[PDB]
Design a protein around this nucleic acid. Structure first.
Ligand SMILES: [Zn+2]
Lengths: 55, 90, 117, 195, 183, 21, 50, 58, 74
RNA sequence: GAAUCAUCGAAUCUUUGAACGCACAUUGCGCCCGCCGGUAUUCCGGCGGGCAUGCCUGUUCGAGCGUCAUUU
RNA sequence: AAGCUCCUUCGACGAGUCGAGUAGUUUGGGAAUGCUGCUCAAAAUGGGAGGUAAAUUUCUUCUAAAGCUAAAUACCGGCCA
RNA sequence: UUGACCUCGGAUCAGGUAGGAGGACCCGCUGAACUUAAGCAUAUCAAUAAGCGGAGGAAAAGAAACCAACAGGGAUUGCCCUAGUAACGGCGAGUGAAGCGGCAACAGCUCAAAUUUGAAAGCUGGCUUCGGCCCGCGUUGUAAUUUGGAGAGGAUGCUUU
C-alpha cells in the first residue's frame, strides 16, 4: 500500500537492469552495513519476483 | 468547480502582500577534481526532496517549499574563492 | 590526593550510635507491626558466581518456581506466608534445586499457619 | 483589497493544494467515491439495521428486569469501530464494508481498502463520516461493517453486495492504480508556460 | 489491528504515501503557529503506545522548534526543548510524553501528550493519579521524561557506570572524604 | 485501587503466622 | 524514468481463502450476555429496593 | 538565623512539638503476643520468651 | 536625583531614567537575589519581617489542621 | 470568672507587594450590577458586589462554497 | 468473581528509533565512555551486550526506543527537643 | 431553505489551575579563571565557583536489551573492601573506576500491542425531594481480561470470597 522509497526504487531499477553489484553497493552506501544491504536486496528481489508472477 | 477563480484571488492577494512587504561551486569542484564521478553525482542527487512537484502547484506554496527545502552540504574555501571571483564584475 | 576542596566535601561519622539505635528501633517497629511473624522473609541458598568464591554459599534473592513447585508451595501464596520469590533465577542444577527444596521443606515443618479470619 | 481570515484562507488553500497536488493511488481511490443510488440503497439497509439507542436499550433492560419480577435470538446489528471492523474483516466475518471518505488522519484508512480487497469482502467508500456517525447513534464513525442479517433480508443483502461488487468495484477497479490530480486551471497553465 | 498497520506505516515512513502526508502536514504546520492545540493526535498509534487516552483531560500540543547547531552543540534535545516550551505555555498541565511528528529543513515538529491533574476523572483513574501526585511537577524541566532519561544515561551496564545513579550525585559520592570515629 | 489488584488482595491476602524455634 | 508509476498489486492479486487467526472463538460469542445479565440483576435489585 | 532571633524577640509562644513517631515501638491489642509482650525487653529477648524465630536471615 | 522610592522594597533604589530598582528589580516579578551576596540574602531573607501567616501555620500543623469547635461550647 | 495568663478548632484582617479595572510619584481616573443621605425619575456625594493574564473541562454564541445530504 | 491442572487450539511484545559517517562536549574507557547536533537510514529463524585461536564467528546472557513504586541514603533550610 | 460533521474564535458564563517565596539536602541546563606543573600553552583546577529553570520531606534511581564465564548470580539504593588495582595520560604534573565478597533495607507492578461484538458493560457536568433524572465525552476506542522467566481459549475437578 505504501510503495517504495527513492533509494529502494533506485535499487529496484538496478536489479531489473541486472546491475546486482551496483545495487548492492548503493544499498550498502545508503544503509551502512553489509548485512542490511544484503537483506534489503533480498526483500526487493522477492518483490520483483512477485510482481513478475502477478503480471 | 475548477478553482481557477479562487486560485486567481489567492495569487493576487499573495502578490499584494509581497508588494506591501557556494554549494553549486563546491559540487563543481568535486566533479572537476578526481573526487566524485557521475554515478556518485546521481547517488547524491537522490535526496529526501527528490520528486518534488513544481509545475502544477501554486506559486506561494512553491516559494515556501523552495525556502524550506535547502539541504546543508559542506563547503570549501576554494569554492568560496571561486564564487567570489565569479561574482566580481567589472 | 587533596587537589580539590575536601574541606567542602568532607563528611563525618559522629552519628554512628544514633543510626544504630534508629535501625534497631526500625526493626522493632517492623516486629511490632508483624508481631507474630518473623522480621525477615525466608531466602534461598545460592552460590557465589566467581571462581574465587565457588566453594562458599550465601543467601539469594528469592526461590525458584521449580523449587517452589517441588516443595509444594503455590507461587501466589508463598509471598503471603513469607517466602521470597525470584522469577529471574534458574536452577540449572539438581544439587541446588534439592538444597532449596530441603530448605523449603524445613520451613514448612517449622511453620505454623493461622486460618484466615 | 479586502483581507480574509487566517483560518479561512488556510482552509481554501488546503483545498487548492489537495486538488492541485499529484495524489498517490491510496488517496486517489479515496477521492473516487461511489454513486447516489448505491449510497441510498446501502443507507436504507443500514437504517433498517441501525444499532439500538441508549433510551430504548435501557428501556428493554427494564423490560427484562420487570419480566424477571413477574427466549430470544442473537441480535443482528451493524458493527462499527475501526479496530472491531478490521478484526472482523481479518476473520472474514464481514459481508460488506463501508468506508468514510474524510477521515482526517487518513492513515487510519489507507490500508483498509487493500486489506478488504485481499480478504475478499466487498468494500465501498461513501461520503461522510458524519453519515456513518448518524447511521450509528454517534457524531462520527470511520468504518461500518455488515456481517450477518436476519432471514427476511438475505435477498436484498445479497443483491446489494452484487450491485456494489459489480457497479462500483469494477468501475473504480479499472482505474485505481494511478495518480490523481492534474486539475490545473487557466492561470495555472499560463503560469507554467511563463515559468 | 489498525494500530499495527499504522506502526508499519511509521516504520516505512519514507514511502510514497507517508512522504506525501508529511509534506502536506508540514505545510499545514508551517502555516499554523509555533505552538498549537490538537484534540486528536496525528499519529494515534504512537500516541497510544506513549500513553495517550481518549479521556477528558488528555490533550496533544504540536510544537515546532528550530533545528541545527547552537561549534558548541546544545546538549538538550529539541524534543526536551519543545516539552519545556509546552510547560511554560501551559504550566497547568503535566507533560505525560512527547513524540516526533514531522521535520523540515528549518523546524522539527513534535507532539506532546499532556494530562490535566485537576480533573476528577484523572483523579479517579488509578493509572494516572501518579502524575496527579505533586512529585511530578515540571518533569520536562527536571528532565524526568523519556528524552530526559536518554540524555541523563539512565541505563544499566558498564557503559553507564558514571551516570546510572546520577552524574552529580556520583561525583559527590566519589569525592567525599568520609572519616569514621575509629580510624 | 485497580480491579485486578483488588481481586488479588481479596483472594491472596497477607497471612498471619509464626516460625517455631 | 517515469516519476509517478502505476502500482502493481503483487501481494493483493492473490485472494486469501482463509481467516488469519486460529485462536478458538470464545463461548461468549455463542452464549447470551452475562454483562446484560448482571445489569438486569442490578435493575431488579433497584426495583425491589424501590 | 534572623528567623530564630525574631522568635527570640517576639512575645509569641514557642510551639513545642510532641514526640510523635510514625510506627509504634510496641505491639498492641487483645492478642497473645501483645498481652505477653514485655516493653522493657528487646525484640530478640521477647522472641526468645515467646519461642518464635525472629530473623530468618543469617 | 538618580534614584527614587521603590514600591516593593521601600528603599531609595529606583533608578529614575531606567525605572528599575537596583535592590529588588521592581518591574521583574522575581525579587533580585544573588548567591555571591550572602549578606544581602540575610538582609532580605524571610524572618526580617513580621510573619503575618507563616507564624500562624505551625500551631495549626501541631493541632492537625482541625476544623470545628470543642464539644459543648457556647 | 480577673489576668500584659495558657491553649486555640471561630472570627476581624488598612495601603502596597507574584499584585489582579486604568494609572501609581495622585489616597487620582474608569465601566457593569445594587443601595444609602442631602431640593431628588434626573443633581451631588458616599458605600457594597465586581471587572488581569495563559491554560483544562463543561455551557452558550458566532464564522467558514471545508464538508454531507434532503423530490416520497 | 478467583487460583489452579490438562491440551488433536492460539500466543500480538514499543521507529527518524537502532545503525553508519561526521562536529562538539564528557569520561579511567575509539569495541567511539555517555550524550547532543547534521546527512543517510534499518531487521523479523530479529535485536543488544559479552565469551572464544581451537577452526568458524559455533557458545553465554538479556530483550532498548512507554510508565509507577515505599525502605535502607543526603540535609549550613522549617517546627522542636 | 433546513439540519448535521469538522475546524477556528468570542463571553465580566460555571468549575479549577500558573506565577512568587524558600532553595541546607535534590534533578537538569550553562559554565569560568586563579593555581600546579618552581617559566607555560594540553592537562589540572573542574564536568567546580557564579548564572538559569524545576520538587519533595526526602529528591533522584529502580525492577536488566544487567553482572558474568560461574558448581552461577538476579530491581534500585548507602557503607567497608575491591583500590590508588584495571585503564588513561605534555606516560611529567597526574587522573582514576567497576565486577565479586561482608553488610543495612528489601516489594513488586501498570500499559500499547486482541473483537465485549450475544448488546460502551466506561466517564464529565447540573438538577435534585439526595433516590435517581438528564446533558455531554467517546467507536479516530472509555470499562473487564492480558504484559514474554508470561498469557489467552476450552475441558476438567478441587479450593477462596
Ligand atoms: Zn525595590
Amino acid at each position: 500500500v505504501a510503495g517504495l522509497a527513492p533509494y529502494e526504487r533506485r535499487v529496484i531499477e538496478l536489479l531489473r537492469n541486472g546491475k546486482d553489484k551496483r545495487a548492492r553497493k548503493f544499498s550498502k552506501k545508503k544503509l551502512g552495513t553489509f548485512g542490511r544491504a544484503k537483506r534489503k536486496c533480498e526483500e526487493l528481489q522477492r518483490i520483483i519476483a512477485e510482481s513478475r508472477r502477478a503480471h | 468547480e475548477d478553482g481557477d477563480q479562487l486560485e486567481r484571488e489567492l495569487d493576487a492577494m499573495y502578490e499584494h502582500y509581497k508588494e506591501r512587504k557556494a554549494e553549486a561551486m563546491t559540487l563543481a569542484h568535486q566533479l572537476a577534481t578526481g573526487e566524485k564521478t557521475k554515478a556518485d553525482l546521481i547517488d547524491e542527487g537522490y535526496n529526501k526532496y527528490a520528486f518534488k512537484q513544481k509545475e502544477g502547484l501554486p506559486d506561494w506554496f512553491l516559494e515556501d517549499e523552495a525556502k524550506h527545502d535547502k539541504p546543508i552540504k559542506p563547503i570549501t574555501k576554494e569554492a568560496a574563492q571561486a564564487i567570489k571571483e565569479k561574482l566580481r564584475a567589472l | 590526593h587533596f587537589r580539590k576542596h575536601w574541606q567542602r566535601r568532607v563528611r563525618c561519622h559522629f552519628d554512628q550510635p544514633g543510626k544504630k539505635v534508629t535501625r534497631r528501633l526500625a526493626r522493632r517497629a517492623k516486629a511490632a507491626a508483624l508481631a507474630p511473624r518473623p522480621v525477615d522473609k525466608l531466602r534461598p541458598i545460592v552460590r557465589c558466581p566467581t571462581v574465587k568464591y565457588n566453594r562458599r554459599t550465601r543467601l539469594g534473592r528469592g526461590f525458584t518456581l521449580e523449587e517452589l513447585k517441588a516443595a509444594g508451595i503455590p507461587r501466589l501464596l508463598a509471598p503471603t506466608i513469607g517466602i521470597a520469590v525470584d522469577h529471574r533465577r534458574k536452577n540449572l542444577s539438581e544439587e541446588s534445586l534439592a538444597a532449596n527444596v530441603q530448605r523449603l521443606k524445613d520451613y514448612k515443618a517449622r511453620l505454623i499457619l493461622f486460618p484466615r479470619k | 483589497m479586502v483581507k480574509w481570515p487566517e483560518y479561512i484562507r488556510l482552509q481554501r488553500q488546503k483545498k487548492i493544494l489537495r486538488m492541485r497536488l499529484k495524489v498517490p493511488p491510496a488517496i486517489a481511490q479515496f477521492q473516487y467515491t461511489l454513486d447516489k443510488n448505491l449510497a441510498a440503497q446501502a443507507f436504507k439497509l443500514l437504517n433498517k439495521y441501525r444499532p439500538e439507542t441508549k433510551q430504548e436499550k435501557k428501556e428493554r433492560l427494564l423490560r427484562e428486569a420487570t419480566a424477571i419480577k413477574e427466549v430470544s435470538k442473537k441480535p443482528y446489528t451493524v458493527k462499527y469501530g475501526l479496530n472491531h471492523v478490521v478484526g472482523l474483516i481479518e476473520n472474514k466475518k464481514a459481508s460488506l464494508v463501508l468506508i468514510a471518505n474524510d477521515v482526517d488522519p487518513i492513515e487510519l484508512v489507507v490500508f483498509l481498502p487493500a486489506l478488504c480487497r485481499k480478504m475478499g469482502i466487498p468494500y465501498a467508500i461513501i461520503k461522510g463520516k458524519a453519515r456513518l456517525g448518524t447511521l450509528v447513534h454517534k457524531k462520527t464513525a470511520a468504518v461500518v461493517a455488515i456481517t450477518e442479517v436476519r432471514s427476511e433480508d438475505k435477498n436484498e443483502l445479497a443483491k446489494l453486495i452484487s450491485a456494489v461488487k459489480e457497479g462500483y468495484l469494477e468501475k473504480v477497479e479499472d482505474t485505481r492504480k494511478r495518480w490523481g490530480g492534474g486539475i490545473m486551471g487557466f492561470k495555472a497553465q499560463k503560469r507554467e508556460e511563463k515559468r | 489491528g489498525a494500530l499495527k498497520y499504522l506502526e508499519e506505516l511509521s516504520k516505512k515512513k519514507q514511502s510514497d504515501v507517508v512522504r506525501f502526508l508529511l509534506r502536506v502536514r508540514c505545510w499545514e504546520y508551517r502555516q499554523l503557529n509555533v505552538i498549537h492545540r490538537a484534540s486528536r493526535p496525528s499519529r494515534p498509534d504512537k500516541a497510544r503506545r506513549l500513553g495517550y487516552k481518549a479521556k477528558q483531560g488528555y490533550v496533544i500540543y504540536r510544537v515546532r522548534v528550530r533545528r541545527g547547531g547552537r561549534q558548541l552543540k546544545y546538549q538538550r534535545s529539541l524534543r526536551a526543548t519543545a516539552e519545556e516550551r509546552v510547560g511554560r505555555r501551559c504550566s497547568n498541565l503535566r507533560v505525560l510524553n512527547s513524540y516526533w511528528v514531522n521535520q523540515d529543513s528549518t523546524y522539527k515538529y513534535y507532539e506532546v501528550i499532556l494530562v490535566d491533574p485537576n480533573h476528577k476523572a484523572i483523579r479517579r483513574d488509578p493509572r494516572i493519579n501518579w502524575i496527579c501526585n505533586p512529585v511530578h511537577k515540571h518533569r520536562e524541566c527536571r528532565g524526568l521524561t523519556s528524552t530526559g532519561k536518554k540524555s541523563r544515561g539512565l541505563n544499566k551496564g558498564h557503559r553507564f557506570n558514571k551516570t546510572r545513579a546520577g552524574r552529580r550525585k556520583t561525583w559527590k559520592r566519589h569525592n567525599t572524604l568520609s572519616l569514621w570515629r575509629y580510624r | 485501587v485497580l480491579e485486578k489488584t483488588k481481586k488479588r488482595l481479596t483472594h491472596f491476602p497477607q497471612r498471619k503466622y509464626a516460625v517455631k524455634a | 524514468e517515469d516519476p509517478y508509476p502505476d502500482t502493481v498489486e503483487w501481494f493483493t492479486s492473490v485472494e486469501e481463502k482463509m481467516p488469519l487467526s486460529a485462536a478458538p472463538e470464545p463461548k461468549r460469542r455463542f452464549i447470551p450476555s452475562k454483562n446484560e445479565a448482571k445489569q438486569i440483576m442490578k435493575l431488579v435489585r433497584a426495583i425491589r429496593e424501590g | 538565623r534572623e528567623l530564630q532571633k525574631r522568635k527570640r524577640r517576639s512575645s509569641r509562644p514557642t510551639i513545642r512539638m510532641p514526640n510523635r513517631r510514625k510506627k509504634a515501638l510496641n505491639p498492641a491489642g487483645n492478642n497473645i503476643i501483645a498481652k505477653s509482650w514485655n516493653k522493657k525487653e528487646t525484640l530478640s529477648q521477647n522472641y526468645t520468651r515467646f519461642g518464635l524465630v525472629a530473623k530468618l536471615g543469617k | 536625583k538618580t534614584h527614587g522610592l521603590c514600591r516593593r522594597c521601600g528603599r531609595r533604589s529606583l533608578h529614575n531614567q531606567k525605572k528599575v530598582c537596583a535592590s529588588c528589580g521592581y518591574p521583574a516579578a522575581k525579587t533580585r537575589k544573588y548567591n555571591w551576596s550572602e549578606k544581602a540574602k540575610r538582609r532580605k531573607v524571610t524572618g526580617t519581617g513580621r510573619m503575618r501567616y507563616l507564624s500562624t501555620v505551625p500551631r495549626r500543623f501541631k493541632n492537625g489542621f482541625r476544623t470545628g469547635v470543642p464539644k459543648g461550647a457556647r
